[PDB]
Amino acid sequence: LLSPETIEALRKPTFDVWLWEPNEMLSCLEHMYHDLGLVRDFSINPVTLRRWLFCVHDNYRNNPFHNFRHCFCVAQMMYSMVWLCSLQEKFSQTDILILMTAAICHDLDHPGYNNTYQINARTELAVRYNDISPLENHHCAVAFQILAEPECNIFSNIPPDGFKQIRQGMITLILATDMARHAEIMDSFKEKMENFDYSNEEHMTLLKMILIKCCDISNEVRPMEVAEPWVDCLLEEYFMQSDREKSEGLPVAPFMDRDKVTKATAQIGFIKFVLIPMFETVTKLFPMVEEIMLQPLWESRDRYEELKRIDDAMKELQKK
Amino acid sequence: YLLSPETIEALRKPTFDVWLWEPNEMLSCLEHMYHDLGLVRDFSINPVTLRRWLFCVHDNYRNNPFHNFRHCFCVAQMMYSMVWLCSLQEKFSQTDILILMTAAICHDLDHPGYNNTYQINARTELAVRYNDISPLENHHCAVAFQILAEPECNIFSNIPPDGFKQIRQGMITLILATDMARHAEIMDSFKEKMENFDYSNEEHMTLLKMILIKCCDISNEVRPMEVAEPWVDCLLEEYFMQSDREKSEGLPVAPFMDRDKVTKATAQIGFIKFVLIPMFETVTKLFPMVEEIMLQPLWESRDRYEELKRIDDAMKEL
Numbered sequence: 001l002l003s004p005e006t007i008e009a010l011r012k013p014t015f016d017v018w019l020w021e022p023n024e025m026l027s028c029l030e031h032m033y034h035d036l037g038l039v040r041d042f043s044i045n046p047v048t049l050r051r052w053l054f055c056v057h058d059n060y061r062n063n064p065f066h067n068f069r070h071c072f073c074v075a076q077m078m079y080s081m082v083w084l085c086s087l088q089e090k091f092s093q094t095d096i097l098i099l100m101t102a103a104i105c106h107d108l109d110h111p112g113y114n115n116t117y118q119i120n121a122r123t124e125l126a127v128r129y130n131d132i133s134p135l136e137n138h139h140c141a142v143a144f145q146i147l148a149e150p151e152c153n154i155f156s157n158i159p160p161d162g163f164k165q166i167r168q169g170m171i172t173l174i175l176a177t178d179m180a181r182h183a184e185i186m187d188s189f190k191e192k193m194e195n196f197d198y199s200n201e202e203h204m205t206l207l208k209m210i211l212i213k214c215c216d217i218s219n220e221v222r223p224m225e226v227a228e229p230w231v232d233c234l235l236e237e238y239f240m241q242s243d244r245e246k247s248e249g250l251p252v253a254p255f256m257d258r259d260k261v262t263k264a265t266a267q268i269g270f271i272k273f274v275l276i277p278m279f280e281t282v283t284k285l286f287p288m289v290e291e292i293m294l295q296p297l298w299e300s301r302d303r304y305e306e307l308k309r310i311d312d313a314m315k316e317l318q319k320k
Numbered sequence: 321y322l323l324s325p326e327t328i329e330a331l332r333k334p335t336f337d338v339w340l341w342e343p344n345e346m347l348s349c350l351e352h353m354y355h356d357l358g359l360v361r362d363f364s365i366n367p368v369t370l371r372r373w374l375f376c377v378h379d380n381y382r383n384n385p386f387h388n389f390r391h392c393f394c395v396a397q398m399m400y401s402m403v404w405l406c407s408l409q410e411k412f413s414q415t416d417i418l419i420l421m422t423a424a425i426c427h428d429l430d431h432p433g434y435n436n437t438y439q440i441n442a443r444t445e446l447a448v449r450y451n452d453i454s455p456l457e458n459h460h461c462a463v464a465f466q467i468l469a470e471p472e473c474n475i476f477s478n479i480p481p482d483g484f485k486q487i488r489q490g491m492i493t494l495i496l497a498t499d500m501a502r503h504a505e506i507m508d509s510f511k512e513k514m515e516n517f518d519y520s521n522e523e524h525m526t527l528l529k530m531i532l533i534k535c536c537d538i539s540n541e542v543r544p545m546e547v548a549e550p551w552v553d554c555l556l557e558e559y560f561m562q563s564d565r566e567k568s569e570g571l572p573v574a575p576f577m578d579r580d581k582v583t584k585a586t587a588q589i590g591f592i593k594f595v596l597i598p599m600f601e602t603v604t605k606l607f608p609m610v611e612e613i614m615l616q617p618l619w620e621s622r623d624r625y626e627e628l629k630r631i632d633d634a635m636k637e638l
């Protein structure tokens with residue numbers, strides 16, 4: 001079970017995600033589906049929603065980063081943003097359901113090695129998906145294989161028109177999380193920012209893509225306390241790949257290269273050039289984003305630059 | 321240089337102002353700790369030996385701004401503090417207490433005022449002698465046992481060879497553990513063993529002894545503001561000697577030693593936040609009493625130098 005202080009904390013991006021066992025996390029997710037009115041408006045069976053949440057959990061691998069606690073971080077951050085940006089005045093319940101279900105499903109069965117590995121290694125997945133966002137395409141297929149199982153089918157009581165619309169929105173959102181598309185998806189968005197229209201379908205579809213993109217990579221929005229161990233987990237996984245890429249002679253990405261990668265320099269760039277501009281142009285629609293998220297991103301960038309100068313000092317002392 | 325009973329009491333706390341005393345009384349303070357800890361008693365250390373050795377050690381520290389005899393008094397005195405604060409007499413044997421104590425006193429003998437990077441890049445005799453491997457700490461540890469090689473400084477003379485081998489080994493691990501080049505390696509080994517620490521486990525206890533000597537080594541900002549701040553000045557002074565000379569010779573200059581780059585604020589903020597605090601954080605998990613006595617001054621000094629840095633940046637608006 002869960003406290004009423006927990007249930008309140010669950011709505012802000014300061015929620016401490018490392019406090020909870022999987023069981024308590026499935027209840028937090030379940031609760032979001034009730035509290036957002038999704039159960040009510042789409043006639044979701046309350047036991048089918050529990051089943052489905054457990055159905056999702058099992059299909060998540062035990063990876064250092066891309067695991068079931070990661071998708072909880074993303075789902076819980078999406079939830080946080082519904083309240084902080086009043087999205088229930090700007091979006092239909094269907095769009096909310098798509099945003100929260102895609103956020104829960106967008107890394108199903110991640111294997112721990114990114115698209116570049118998949119392709120360069122000519123994996124089954126790269127071969128099945130023709131080098132085209134193989135992981136993200138795999139994530140959707142799993143999410144809908146899960147929903148094709150009737151007792152995991154939280155959509156059982158939605159009419160087929162509604163299903164098709166939800167399934168199409170989920171596919172877009174999950175496929176939009178492929179970071180190779182970041183500059184493209186960002187450019188389309190800001191272009192529409194010169195005159196953003198809530199009644200333009202393309203515009204809403206682009207705002208949702210950015211919204212799930214924001215949640216996916218929002219660990220440094222959380223308090224330094226919560227954010228910091230995530231970078232550790234990320235580098236683990238990343239070194240796990242680059243080690244493989246060399247027992248294999250495959251190219252090695254500099255940001256996974258043990259010889260060139262510190263915790264400071266893994267974040268300093270990523271905050272400055274990816275996380276801040278993204279939340280900036282998002283703040284242009286929700287000013288109250290500036291205080292609650294764009295702020296921890298400035299203090300995070302500033303801490304990690306300090307850490308880099310200490311790290312470098314220490315790197316004089318070895319390398320002889 | 322007879323110690324007053326007031327001084328005996330202040331000597332056991334990290335608040336001890338290390339600046340009042342001259343080499344005479346520091347020597348006396350060091351002497352009291354060997355008696356007070358049971359080391360004179362339990363290793364049959366001749367008391368007159370223990371006086372010559374201390375002056376034997378005192379001669380072999382140079383007059384550097386920072387790495388000098390007063391620095392070695394602080395490091396031994398903070399160790400002494402920690403034996404009482406964390407009650408390490410309950411956790412460690414009197415040989416371990418002997419290793420920790422003697423290694424603190426000797427850990428920087430004959431320091432020249434130029435770190436390992438200078439020794440290596442200038443290709444000095446120390447670096448050539450030690451094959452670029454921790455040439456200072458290798459040399460500190462070697463002077464120590466050259467001093468104990470003399471019969472009139474061998475405060476170990478009544479220890480059976482089985483014992484001497486036992487102490488010499490541990491002393492060497494500790495002194496060479498204070499090479500800051502190895503900070504992350506040693507801390508990481510410690511955080512590993514700490515996930516399920518074991519006082520019965522020799523490897524778990526050698527890392528803990530290494531953390532302790534490393535803790536006391538850089539413990540200056542655990543002292544009160546009035547005691548610590550002048551150490552920051554001696555530090556930049558020694559460093560500024562190194563980087564000035566590096567410049568005259570066409571040697572690389574470490575940015576954190578650069579006269580035209582470093583402020584007292586930037587010397588201390590990252591060091592406290594990313595080396596001192598995290599290190600004492602992991603010790604506090606075996607010895608929670610440390611949070612109150614040593615984290616407490618470390619958080620205060622953090623914030624203090626942080627506001628000092630904002631003041632500096634704002635004033636850099638001329």
Ligand SMILES: C[C@@H](Nc1nc2c(cnn2C2CCCC2)c(=O)[nH]1)C(=O)N1CC2(COC2)C1
Binds near residue numbers: 216219220234
């Ligand atoms: C710079 C480095 N840092 C980095 N990657 C992250 C974070 C969160 N998710 N991801 C990955 C992004 C999604 C998977 C985890 C984070 O806080 N930092 C990195 O991996 N970047 C992102 C790319 C990879 O393609 C751009 C270079």
Ligand SMILES: C[C@@H](Nc1nc2c(cnn2C2CCCC2)c(=O)[nH]1)C(=O)N1CC2(COC2)C1
Binds near residue numbers: 310501588
């Ligand atoms: C600028 C300097 N500040 C700094 N270094 C210290 C202290 C005490 N000993 N040391 C060094 C410890 C070894 C001797 C002096 C202190 O209070 N501040 C710093 O942050 N660094 C990074 C290193 C660690 O190795 C490079 C020195």
Ligand SMILES: [Mg+2]
Binds near residue numbers: 106107135177
């Ligand atoms: Mg993904």
Ligand SMILES: [Mg+2]
Binds near residue numbers: 427428498
């Ligand atoms: Mg030293």
Ligand SMILES: [Zn+2]
Binds near residue numbers: 107
């Ligand atoms: Zn993700």
Ligand SMILES: [Zn+2]
Binds near residue numbers: 427428498
């Ligand atoms: Zn020292």
